[PDB]
Design a protein around this ligand. Structure first.
Ligand SMILES: [Mg+2]
Ligand SMILES: [Mg+2]
Ligand SMILES: [Mg+2]
Lengths: 59, 108, 49, 166, 289, 295, 148
């Protein structure tokens, strides 16, 4: 819990890269979770004016 | 030996109910990351800037880096770095620069 | 308060989530069980004192 | 009318305690009620901002605008004022701090049209202000390098806070 | 023309406002302003702090060297006889020295008792910080010490203010026991330590080395930096979490942009656990034993 | 004597500052000398100046920025003066330009300056381990396709000749030197306190000895820019910024019986005269050949 | 309006109420007219109440000036340096009393929009969520497609 201020803040708002396999999946159900992860709506720290959103790689 | 959620991550969680019934207590000590689950620190340091003949020339060879681009391509490169669209990087007019607060409030 | 726990108290929140999950499973257990006898530990309803 | 700019040259400062940095000279000067338009004048006055006085004189020397020669005359006057009245060595050592055009008092005339209609016409006048400061010209700002933009962006991401959060 | 006084007067007020906006007047002593009674002020100081001072000792505590030398300038330039009554003034030097010495002792004891694992260099750094120019001036000026202090040059340059604050401390030490003054110190100084970090005020530049030495002292061997979590290495904004391991147990862990930065962080964290300067740590006790 | 590279710099600069402050102290007052203008352009113009303070550059500033930028060298009476060299007595002044009709004086000066720059670039471009002795800047005519500088190097370094990489490094460093604009400063010294500056370079001390030998009063002419000091014949250009195109062309090993001396040849042109890319390439090709005039 | 005006976070001056409580109001200055009707209430207040008020609050110095004014004012002044002006012009004794109380109990901080109702240093005890806090670690710490 004890971090300096800067690294703490950096860790919290850090971007993340998710990998999502697409084979034999409906593009809709794919796009649903892809959408959530793009907007950063999976983060408890979410807000619309924070840039938070993560990279999603679909293959 | 039962918890509703796996103890893999975060905390190992224990849920107890007071004999009275009127209080729930939870014991949750942190779960540390096991050694076997980590990988060794990447170590990269190499200096080839050295010329065997002149090494104050070699120390001046690391100072030899710089470049300049145009507005457009600079912005394209910038927006590829941070995975942004091009638009963010353009300037803003007098009117908008002037209304930024000089001294924003600070918390903590 | 629940949101603030979720952000600033990830442990306590995982506890709450554990509790809820437990209570739910208890509920399904009681509904499928089809009898009045079992009272899940967390499904007991306390009155004020 | 309002005449202020003139009086700016009548200000007297308190003497400099030794050890303090030497204060650069300032010369305010202007020409009132020129027969140029205010706007046409503005382009000129804008051109020579931040130029060393000799550079501005060179630029004005070859412009074809009617205002070019007015401004030039005002600059020579200001230069000689600066060496004579205020104390400035090196009459080449001035740069143009401020250059601008104000509007004067306009005359009003008739402009005839046809079918006996008329427009109302304005004979236009304007003011030219200049302020000269003693020293080399301050350096023109280079645009932001990729490094600068990157630093700013990073700094911004780092200023983020958990919002409505506590 | 419009007939009336009212709008004209009301506008005179606007004129004055603009005049003060375009040229701000240089700050003036509260003493040279319209409502002032020095005595009543002094008494009120004491009562509001919930302390009991000898009025002689306090009045002494707010006196400075500079005020006396300026008063001797005014004395010698007008040909006046002052010397007896003016050199009878008994400046605050003495009081300030007792004050600073006692405050450093007191503080040092407080910390030493609260953080048994703080190295002496650390506790020194802390006392240094709470006795600093910045902190003491801030607190003093917010207690209306700058208001009461007798000095030349009204903004009352920071060394004079430190002098004057601790002067008041010493005056309290004479007026009441070391117990009372210890309470005053833990209330108006130690509270400035609220929200602050350790390494915010300690400033040490090589966390790793310091950690290794402290672990030699604890008879633990070799912290090994082991990379735990990471996201993007190829990005312009990577995140690393470096863990520190001692005999394959994890002692502490930290985030950063670069693996080096992060390693250094894990060091600072480990340090903070060892020394018991932590977020989770017991908040300070404010109580009446 | 055990000394670091930076210590030599420090000692030399402090000696130079001592001497300059001594020359400053020699003049008690603000003394007024009357300079006249013999120039083709603004005749009869008279400057009233501070003796041993005012310079012909500070003189041009009374005229216009045009002189300031266009004037490389200042003819005082019949002699070439460096733009920042303080005027001594009352006199007459004429200003000298690159596009002037008989530029030769100026040309010489320009060449010298460039040479000196290269000298600096060389001395500091080698590893601390080795020992770089600058010799002199042999005065070539400008029809000769380059300017050059003589340098002796550590004995263990005697086998290698540089690669286009290294030469291009010299050039990069010279351009680095041009970018930041350094005035060329001048001082007149007595040999006694001249030799104390150079010391460790033998060849320098010899040069100073001859140079002072042909002058009755034992006067040595010093020039310095930034931290670098060197002795030279005749005046130099006012600024470093005056050079635009600059190259260190090539080096040539030439050996006496008693020494092994490398000759560094380079080529440059001032902003005023700057030459087209093609022209430049041709001149650059000629500047590779050995240029010999020592006499 | 909120975009219109300035704003501040919730704070105390000098961490008041942590170690001990210090009444922030420092001095109080009244100006009134013995003669003018506008000041009537303010006079009565000075008669009856001021005295008692002064005992109830030992730490505040109260300066009363009778002078020829048309508009009686009370100038509150705080430890903070903050100066707050008020007009007791044409009010009861009751009204003035209530006003002087408000002045007594205020912090002296500026009254503007307060961004949020709470202020915490170290809100975060036991951690602060970050993207990895709830994620499981793998063996060898390999990435998704990484092979060893
Ligand atoms: Mg008609
Ligand atoms: Mg119209
Ligand atoms: Mg019109």
């Amino acid at each position: 819990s004890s971090f300096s201020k800067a690294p703490q803040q950096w860790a919290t708002f850090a971007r993340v890269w998710y990998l999502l396999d697409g084979k034999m999946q409906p593009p809709g159900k794919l796009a649903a979770m892809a959408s959530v992860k793009l907007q950063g709506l999976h983060k408890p720290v979410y807000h619309q004016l924070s840039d938070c959103g993560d990279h999603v790689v679909i293959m | 030996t039962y918890s509703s959620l796996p103890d893999d991550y975060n905390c190992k969680v224990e849920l107890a109910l007071t004999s009275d019934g009127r209080t729930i207590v939870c014991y949750h000590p942190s779960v540390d990351i096991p050694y076997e689950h980590t990988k060794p620190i990447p170590r990269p340091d190499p200096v080839h800037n050295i010329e065997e003949t002149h090494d104050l020339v070699l120390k001046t060879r690391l100072e030899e880096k710089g470049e300049h681009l145009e507005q457009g391509p600079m912005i394209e490169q910038l927006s590829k770095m941070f995975f942004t669209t091009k638009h963010r990087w353009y300037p803003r007019g007098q009117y908008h620069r002037r209304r930024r607060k000089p001294n924003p409030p600070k918390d903590r | 308060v629940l949101a603030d726990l979720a952000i600033y108290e990830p442990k306590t929140f995982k506890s709450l989530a554990a509790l809820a999950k437990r209570r739910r499973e208890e509920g399904f257990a009681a509904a499928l069980g089809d009898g009045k006898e079992p009272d899940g530990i967390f499904s007991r309803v306390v009155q004020h004192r | 009318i309002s005449r202020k700019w003139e009086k700016k040259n009548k200000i007297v400062y308190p003497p400099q305690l030794p050890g303090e940095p030497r204060r650069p000279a300032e010369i305010y000067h202007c020409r009132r009620q020129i027969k140029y338009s205010k706007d046409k004048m503005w382009y000129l006055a804008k051109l020579i901002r931040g130029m060393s006085i000799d550079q501005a004189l060179a630029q004005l020397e070859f412009s074809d605008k009617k205002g070019a020669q007015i401004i030039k005359e005002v600059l020579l006057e200001a230069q000689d004022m600066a060496v004579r009245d205020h104390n400035v060595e090196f009459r080449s050592n001035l740069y143009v701090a401020e250059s601008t055009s104000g509007r004067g008092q306009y005359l009003k005339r008739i402009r005839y049209h046809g079918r006996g209609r008329f427009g109302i016409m304005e004979k236009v006048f304007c003011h030219y202000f200049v302020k000269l400061v003693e020293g080399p010209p301050p350096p023109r700002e280079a645009p932001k390098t990729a490094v600068a933009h990157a630093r700013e962006y990073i700094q911004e991401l780092r200023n983020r806070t958990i919002t409505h959060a506590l | 023309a419009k007939k009336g006084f009212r709008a004209a007067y009301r506008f005179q007020k606007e004129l004055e406002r603009w005049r003060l906006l375009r040229c701000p007047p240089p700050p003036v002593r509260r003493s040279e302003k319209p409502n002032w009674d020095y005595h009543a002020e002094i008494q009120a100081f004491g009562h509001r702090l919930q302390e009991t001072f000898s009025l002689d000792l306090l009045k002494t505590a707010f006196v400075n060297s500079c005020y006396i030398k300026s008063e001797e300038a005014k004395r010698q330039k007008l040909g006046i006889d002052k010397e007896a009554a003016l050199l009878n003034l008994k400046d605050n030097q003495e009081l300030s020295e007792q004050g600073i010495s006692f405050s450093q002792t007191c503080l040092t004891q407080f910390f030493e008792d609260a953080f048994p694992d703080l190295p002496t260099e650390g506790v020194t750094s802390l006392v240094d910080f709470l006795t600093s120019e910045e902190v003491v001036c801030h607190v003093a000026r917010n207690l209306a010490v700058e208001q009461l202090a007798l000095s030349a040059e009204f903004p009352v340059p920071p060394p004079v203010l430190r002098q004057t604050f601790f002067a008041v401390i010493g005056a309290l030490l004479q007026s009441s026991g070391p117990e009372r003054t210890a309470l005053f110190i833990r209330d108006f100084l130690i509270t400035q330590m609220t929200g602050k970090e350790l390494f915010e005020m300690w400033t040490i530049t090589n966390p790793m080395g310091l950690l290794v030495e402290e672990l030699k002292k604890r008879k633990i061997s070799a912290p090994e930096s082991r990379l735990t979590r990471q996201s993007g290495s190829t990005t312009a904004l990577p995140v690393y979490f470096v863990g520190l391991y001692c005999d394959r147990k994890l002692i502490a862990e930290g985030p950063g942009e670069t693996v080096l930065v992060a390693e250094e962080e894990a060091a600072r964290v480990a340090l903070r656990k060892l020394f018991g300067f932590t977020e989770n740590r017991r908040p300070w006790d404010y109580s009446k034993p | 004597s055990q000394l670091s590279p930076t210590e030599l710099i420090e000692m030399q600069n402090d000696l130079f500052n001592k001497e300059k402050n001594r020359q400053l102290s020699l003049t008690p007052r603000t003394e007024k000398i009357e300079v006249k203008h013999v120039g083709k352009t603004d005749p009869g113009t008279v400057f009233v100046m501070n003796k041993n303070i005012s310079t012909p550059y500070s003189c041009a500033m009374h005229l216009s920025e045009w002189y300031c930028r266009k004037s490389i060298l200042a003819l005082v009476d019949g002699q070439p003066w460096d733009m920042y060299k303080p005027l001594t007595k009352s006199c007459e002044i004429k200003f000298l330009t690159f596009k002037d009709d008989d530029p030769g004086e100026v040309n010489k000066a320009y060449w010298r300056s460039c040479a000196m720059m290269m000298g600096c670039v060389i001395e500091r471009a080698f590893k601390d381990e080795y020992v770089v002795s600058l010799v002199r800047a042999p005065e070539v005519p400008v029809i000769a396709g380059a300017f050059c500088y003589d340098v002796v190097l550590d004995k263990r370094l005697d086998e290698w000749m540089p690669t286009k990489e290294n030469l291009h490094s010299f050039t990069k460093d010279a351009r680095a030197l041009i970018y930041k604009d350094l005035p060329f400063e001048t001082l007149e010294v007595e040999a006694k306190v001249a030799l104390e500056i150079f010391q460790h370079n033998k060849y320098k001390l010899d040069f100073i000895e001859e140079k002072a030998s042909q002058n009755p009063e034992r006067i040595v002419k010093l020039h310095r820019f930034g931290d670098f000091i060197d002795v030279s014949e005749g005046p130099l250009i006012p600024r470093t910024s005056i050079c635009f195109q600059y190259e260190v062309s090539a080096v040539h090993n030439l050996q006496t019986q008693s020494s092994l001396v490398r000759r560094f040849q380079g080529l440059s042109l001032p902003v005023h005269l700057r030459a087209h890319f093609t022209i430049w390439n041709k001149l650059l090709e000629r500047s590779r050949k050995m240029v010999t005039e020592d006499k | 309006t909120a975009r219109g005006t300035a704003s501040r976070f919730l704070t105390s001056v000098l961490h008041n109420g942590l170690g001990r409580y210090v009444q922030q109001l420092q001095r109080l200055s009244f100006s009134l007219s013995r003669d003018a009707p506008s000041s009537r209430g303010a006079r009565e207040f000075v008669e009856r109440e001021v005295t008692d008020f002064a005992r109830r609050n030992p730490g505040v110095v109260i300066y009363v000036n009778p002078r020829p004014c048309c508009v009686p004012r009370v100038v509150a002044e705080y430890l903070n340096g903050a100066v707050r002006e008020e007009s007791i012009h044409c009010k009861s004794v009751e009204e003035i009393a209530a006003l002087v109380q408000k002045l007594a109990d205020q912090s002296g901080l500026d009254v503007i929009r307060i961004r949020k109702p709470f202020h915490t240093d170290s809100p975060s005890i036991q951690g602060q969520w970050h993207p990895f806090t709830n994620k499981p670690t793998t063996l060898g710490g390999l990435r998704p497609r990484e092979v060893q």
